[model samples]
Target chain A: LPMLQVALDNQTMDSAYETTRLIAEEVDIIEVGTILCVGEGVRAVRDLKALYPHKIVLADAKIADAGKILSRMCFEANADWVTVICCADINTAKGALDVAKEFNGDVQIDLTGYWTWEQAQQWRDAGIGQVVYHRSVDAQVAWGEADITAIKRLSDMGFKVTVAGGLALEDLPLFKGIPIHVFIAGRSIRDAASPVEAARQFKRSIAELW
Target chain B: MSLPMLQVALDNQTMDSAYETTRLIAEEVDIIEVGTILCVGEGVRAVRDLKALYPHKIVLADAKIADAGKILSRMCFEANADWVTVICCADINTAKGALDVAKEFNGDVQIDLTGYWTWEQAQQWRDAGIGQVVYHRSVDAQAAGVAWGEADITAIKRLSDMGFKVTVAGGLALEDLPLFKGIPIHVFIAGRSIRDAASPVEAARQFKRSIAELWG
Candidate 1:
């Protein structure tokens, strides 16, 4: 069965807190989306961690280099998971993965364009556990595809996939038979009339599919 | 004479802009502070991405933790903060809360003395086991329109008295280094002086020389 993940692509700190407070029970993982982190800074991470202590809080930090240093900062905030852009050079990705493993935190390889399956095989071989199969321009916003296709593909390739980027209720049907570890829906559930209800709806959908 | 440590504070709007300016002067600095506005304005993801691109430098997140210490500190720390700061006015509870979280993950939290400036508060914080402090002029300066003079002198003096390693900030310049005569400044935080300079390295080198002359 697929897990229903909610990405709090919240625009500001206030909204991030309010959304998390409302939907903590229904959502499986809480993401400090790139937009929210850009708007809220550490406050975004701090507030979310407090609201959902037991929930998986991913700081979509999207780290590039100086791995040990950035890992220290994010892990210090108790971020259970971080993102490493695929565009970052091998050394940068290597350092991030090394430090991330050292910190005992998880690293999600964000296929931020330019990453190849060959590299995924290498990362998977290197023991990196998760991969966020995404489609983005330069990290600000997602353009082409953020779907179950990428997640399903990556999953088929023997990697845990956390799909993200502007997912909505309509997109839920696409992953019917996919071995998706995490189904990411950021703006869809968050900007709804009732976030809890929306999150609950996603959860219900996943349960129904099962 | 040795130079006072130079940190390049990226306060610009984009990673490309900050990176270009930093690449032009990254070699002359001791640390890289991904300023709060820049981090939030752009994204810590970009900062981490930038740090990822550089790979050699330490990235400091200017995540001013005034309220939710652990939450904010953890975000910056995770986003790739080698060092993070919290406002001094933040109560002992918040500061200690962040420091504890930082320690649990093997990171350092800095107490930015932006508003809280009393010896009592300093002593209280000094005992909190935090490793560093960013010494800045108070936010109350605008209403009082108080020019920085004996106040900074007294602040540096008092912080020195408390045994807290100080990183002085707030529009600091190379020429003003002499004013800190015989003071122990662990780090000198500069912004436009280094980033906006026509010659970033020259500005950094000058500050380095000036800091050494004062401390030596």
Candidate 2:
């Protein structure tokens, strides 16, 4: 079953905490998103982890450089996972993975820019097990949909693939046969009139699809 | 004579170290970058505190933003950052969103030409009203022992010729300044060169003095 992750992307700690508290029980993962991490720092990761010790907490640091330093900061703040951008060199990802291993945490390569199969192969060869098939926020605004074929290919490559970028409940069926390890909902849940219900709907949708 | 501004990048892992280095060299440098590491580690607090402490200096939040540019850039600007950064490889729309926010706050946006970026993309950024770019021997490249060479000078010259205010960074030192002598570099970013120096204040002053000797 694919786990549901709520991305707390609010720009303030209080708002992020409020959203996480509202949807805590409904999701399997609590992500301290890039905005929250940059707006309030890794303390967002610590606070959420302290509140929900059982749920997986991720810090979407979107690390571009100084991967070891950035990833180590998130892990020290108690994040179970941190993200590195794909545009960064393979060495950056490897550096982050090295730090993750030391902390018993994990690194997710965010496919944000021009990435190729060659790069993906390098990441896998480097022992990076997870990747996020992210669509740019601008693409989503331009009515771009998730690339189902790309997701399936990454999964076939033996990577734990997470799908994000303006994901909605209707989009789950598009990924029906794909082995998506996680489904990340940011604004779809966070901005909904009833965030808890929105989260519950996402879980129900995922359960039915899987 | 056009003198290039000196941007001191605080890539320290902790705020304490960043502050110590900033306190030592803040008066000498023209711009202070809360580098990507410190931004992720300390968030907007890093930007706000540094700006408050050095009210006269221009503070840039090196967010290295790849996506969600509007919100993330807004977060940095709201924290009183005079400038924010976006990756050059990001979607044009992403850059446009960041530019939109920059207009709202009367701040500035710099495109980091780090990974595989092209002249076509540079043109797109120019058409979109982006005026600044950072050409790099990226951290990864530096670690891989990629040395600054004539090719970097050519690229910086080309970018500057395209009417973009080019900023060069990544493992730069005093010796490298002469290589860009006649080029129209808008800024030169120094991280470890200044932050890791035995006398950071003197290191920063030396860079400014060297810039004066070359450009003036």
Candidate 3:
């Protein structure tokens, strides 16, 4: 079953707070997307967590490298789960995983840049279970279709996948029946009129796929 | 009449490692480096934790700030970092971004020698009002075995002469002081030789003895 993760990629607390109340009833998890984490820091997550205490708050800290430290930052920010990009070095992965397991938190390894199944198996060997498939931004823009293919390959290989990038409502049909754990929507939903309503529409479209 | 400074590099993944390393090295070292690993790892909170534990020791954060003067400096200042770093090789726009942040924090800025920084660039950083520079040895690769030569010496000499407090780093030993003898180096950074040494205290003592013998 596809889950409903309301990614809070909003700019300020005031706006995210206003929108959270409207969507909190339906959304399963709240993701503090990179925009806010970088702009306002983790206060964005804490502000929402202060109000809605039980929601699973995820920080897309996108720890491309230096895992242990960045993951700690997420935990300190009250992040229940945080992200580590596959682009990070093995040492970085080792660092990130240590913190997550220590804090009883979860680590999401974003193999968003291309990697083979052998690469996936190696990370799993290192006790990394959460996997995300992606292409490097430096790749040709034509690889958008390739990213979707990579996602399917990874999901079939028993890794959880989260897709990011210019997500549109139209992409919903492509993910039908895929065991994708999270769909990380950014500007398309956060930059909308009434984020709650936009999020509801996003939730509904994904529901249609399920 | 002077006590040599002892320094510790917080190179761990978590704040716990930083706290623990400080505990082990604090009594011996005079300064604490909130290494680049710790700075971005703990974010500002990393610096805050160090400050909370050892308010008396001088704490420097390896922010290695690439851009955004106001925001990044605000981040460093809120954490109470004693010194923040900016790459001298960065364009004027990027370096000034950090300089503005440093001014707001009332914190010291250390201009770092990077791959592309020129003598002109160092002069520009000085003319633009930065207070310090960290002279580094090429860790990644050096000019086909010329290895820490005129570029390092000339830059340190020039920056020191220009009235900026220069700190030399990268696998330094007490003996290297002779090379830096005339330069008024404010701080000397040593990582592996100190951290990996069989006896860090002995290493520090030797470094101090050598520095004093050469420069004292």
Please provide, for model 2 over B1-216, each residue's C-alpha lDDT reduced to its tens digit, 9 standing for 90 to 100. 479999999987679989899878888899999998888777788998999999788999999888888888888888898999998768888899998998998899999987667788899999999999999776876787889887888888888888999999988999999988888788999999998889998999899999999999
lDDT of 3 by residue, B109-187 (tens): 7876633345676677877888788776633222223256766787677777788877777556656666766566777
* Model 3 Cα shift for residue B171 (angstroms): 12
User: Per-residue alpha-carbon lDDT of model 1 for B153-188, expressed as tens digits?
Assistant: 887777777777778776677777777777777788
Model 3 reproduces a share of the real contacts of 0.03
Instruction: Flag regions of model 2 displaced more than 4 Å.
Output: A138-146
Question: Where does the lowest 10-residue lDDT sum fall in candidate 3 chain B?
Answer: B138-147
- In the predicted model 3, the residue pairs found to clash are A68-A95, A68-A96, A112-A134, B6-B29, B6-B30, B69-B97
> How close to the true structure is residue B183 of candidate 1, measured as C-alpha lDDT?
76
Q: What TM-score do all the candidates reach, one by one?
A: 0.53, 0.94, 0.55
Task: Kindly report the docking quality category of candidate 3.
Answer: incorrect
Model 1 chain A: weakest 10-residue lDDT segment is A135-144
Candidate 2, residue B38: Cα displacement in angstroms equals: 2.0
Model 3 over residues A1-210: C-alpha lDDT tens digits? 566676665545666766676777767778875545544556666666777778888876656444655677678767788876553445556677788887787888755422346656667777776764443444414436666777777776666777655566677777776777876655566677776677778788887777
Candidate 2 lDDT by residue in tens digits, A1-210? 999999988888888877877889999999988888888887888888999999999998888777777888888889999998887777789888999999898999988766778888989999999999886654664223347778878999999999888888887887888788999998999899999899999998888888
lDDT of each: 0.69, 0.87, 0.65
